[PDB]
Amino acid sequence: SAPLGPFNATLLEQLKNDYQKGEKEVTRYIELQEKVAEKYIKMTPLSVTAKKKLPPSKDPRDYMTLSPYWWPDSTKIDGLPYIRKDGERNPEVYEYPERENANRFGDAAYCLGVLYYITGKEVYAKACANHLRTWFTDPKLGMNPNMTYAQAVPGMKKMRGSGFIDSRRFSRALGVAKLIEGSKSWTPSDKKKLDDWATAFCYWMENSTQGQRESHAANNHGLWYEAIHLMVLAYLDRTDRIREVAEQSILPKMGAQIADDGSLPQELKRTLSLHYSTFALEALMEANQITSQIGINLWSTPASNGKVASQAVDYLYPFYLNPEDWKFKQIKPFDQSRAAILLYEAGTALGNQKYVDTAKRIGLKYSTSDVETIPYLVLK
C-alpha cells in the first residue's frame, strides 16, 4: 500500500506490483520512464536564491514572482502602477527565475521519487534527495517557508494572497518526499529538516494574513489553496486534519462555486473560461487523490447545499468532446488533452464508464516525458 501522497495511489501501487512481478508491458513502460528520468539524475539542483533582482525583504531565499496578468501602464511615465489584462501573460514573468525553476524542480523531484517507489533503485532516491535538500532545507540555498512575495505586482498598494497558487509547483515535490523515506540517501536528519520546513510552511499558510485571505477565495484559488494544504498535511501525516479540511473547507467551497446547471460562474467570467473551469476541477482532482486515500471521495460527496462536484464535470463533458462548442470567452486555445487525466480521475471515482472511455479515447502519448502522466499507463 503506497504511502500517503499527491498521486493516484491505486495506479501507483498497481505499477509497482506489476513491475515487481516482471510483467512485460509495465516493465517496458517503466524502462522508458527510467530513460526519461536520466536527465534528472544529472540535472544540477535548482534554488530560489538564483536571482539578481531581490525582493523587498532583500533575502534571496524569499520566493518572488510577478502576477502573470499585470503589465506596465504605458500611459504612465514609469509604467506604474501595473494594470491587469486578464488571460494575457506578461513575458516579464520569465524575469523571475523561480517561476520556471519551481516547475523544473517539481518535475525532477516528482519523477525521481515515483521511480524510486516503483523500482526501488537507490539511484532515484539519491537524486530526488539532492533536489529536495537544495530547494527546501539547505541553510543557504533553501527557500524560506513562506509565499509573501509570490505574484507581487509593481505599484500595487495592498498585500495579496493570490500568489499562493504558485505553491502547487513545489508542494507536489514535498509530498513525494514521503516515497523516499527508508532509502539510504534520505537520512533521519534529512526527514527531520524537511518536516520542520513543512511545519513552518503550514503555519505560514494557515496563519499569515495572505494565507488566511487565500483560504477564503471564492474561485479556483480557494480550491487550489486547499489542494496544496492537503499536500502539506499529508506529507506531515495529519490525517485527521485532512478529513476536517475536506469536510469543512473543500466541499463547502466546491458547493458554493457550482451553479444549478453545473457551470462554474466564477470561472465563466474569465477571458480563459474553459481553461479556468478545468483548472478549478483539477484542484479538486488533486485534492481527491489525497482525500480518497483516507476514504473521502470529493467527486461524489455532496456539499451542505446539495451541490456535488460530479455536476461540474457533467456540465463540461460535452465541451471536452468538442472544445469548439464552448460559448464563453476563451482567448487562447484549450488543451483538450487535459481532459484525459481529469475524466479518468472523475470517471473512476464516479463509476462513470462513459467518462473513462472518453478519457482513454482522448488518451495520452505513450512516450511523453510529461511527468504528471507517469502513473497513467492506463491512458497511453
Next chain:
Amino acid sequence: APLGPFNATLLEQLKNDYQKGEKEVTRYIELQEKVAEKYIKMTPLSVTAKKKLPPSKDPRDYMTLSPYWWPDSTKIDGLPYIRKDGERNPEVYEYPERENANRFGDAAYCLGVLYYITGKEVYAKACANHLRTWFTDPKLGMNPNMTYAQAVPGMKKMRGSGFIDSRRFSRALGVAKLIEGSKSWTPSDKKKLDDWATAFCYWMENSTQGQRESHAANNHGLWYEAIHLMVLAYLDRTDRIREVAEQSILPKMGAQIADDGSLPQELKRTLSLHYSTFALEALMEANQITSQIGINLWSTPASNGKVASQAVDYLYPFYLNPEDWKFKQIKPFDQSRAAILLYEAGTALGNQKYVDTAKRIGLKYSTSDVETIPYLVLKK
C-alpha cells in the same frame, strides 16, 4: 528631413511647430522628453550579454529561437523541435538579444527622433552611446550577420526566416542619420557605422540565408525588403531603393495579393488577421522610405495592375469589427495597430474614411510606445 525609417512629413511638421513655439506641439514634445529620460540613463545593451553561445562560439553573433518551435515531449531529448503555428515558445526569452534588440531599438529611435526635433545635444550623445555599443564596438558590437537568428534545435537545414528579427535594430540604424552633424557623433563614428551597414548589406544580399529570405512568398519577403530599404536609405542609396521597389516589392505585392484583395499566404496562418496586418505593416514601413523619394507603394501598381490599397480595402471592415473575422485567429487581434496603419495608407491614398477611422481608433496621448512619437495627429 534626412532620409530614414519614419513618416518624414509628420516629423518635419513636429520640428517646425516645435521651433515656432506652437503650444500644443511644445507640450507634446515636453511629454516625449520626460518619457525619454529613462533612455538617457539606460545602460547601452550588447548582443554579447549571453551565456549560451551560438555554434560559432562567438558572442557577437546574434542568436534567437524561432518562436513557434517547441520541444517534442515524445522524444527523449525533445529533438527535433516541432512547430505549433502561432504559439510562442516561452523558451525564446532565454535568448537575451530577442528583447534586448527591442529595448535597444526603442532607445535609439526615441533619442534620435527627439534630437532631430529639439536639437538638444544630450539626445544625440545618448543615441550615439547606444548605437556604438550595439553596432560598431570591437568587443560589444554585433557581427553584421543574422546566421543564427531564429535557429531551431534539431533542425538539419539552414533557414533565412530569422532575418525578420533585423527590423528591431534596423530602424535604429536608419535613425542614426538624424544625429549626423551633432557634436557627439564624430566622423569616425559615422565611418564605422557606414562600414558595418555596408557589411550587413552585403551579407543580406549575398548570403544564402539572405537570398532565400529575399524570395520568401509571404510577409517575410516584404519585411525583408523593408529592412533592406532601411539599410539602403541609411547608406543614401536612393537608386537601389527605386530598384528594390520596382523589381522586388511591387512584384511580391502583385503575387501575394489575391484578386479579392486578401492575402492568401497570411490566411493560412493560425493568426491570420495578425499576419495579414503584419504584411501591410511591412509595406507601410517600406512606403515611409520610398515615398521620401517619390514612390507611393500604396497606389503604385504591380505589372498585373494590383495595388496594395486593395489589401487595405479587404481588411478595413475587420479593423472596424475584428470579431467578424472569418479565418483562424487563435489569439485576439490588437485593434490599435489599425491606427497608424490606416493613417499611413489613408493619407497616402487620400482616403478620408481611413484617416477618420484611424483617428477614431486613436493612440493614447501619453503613451510611451516609441513608434507613436511622430503621431500626435492620432493622439487628439
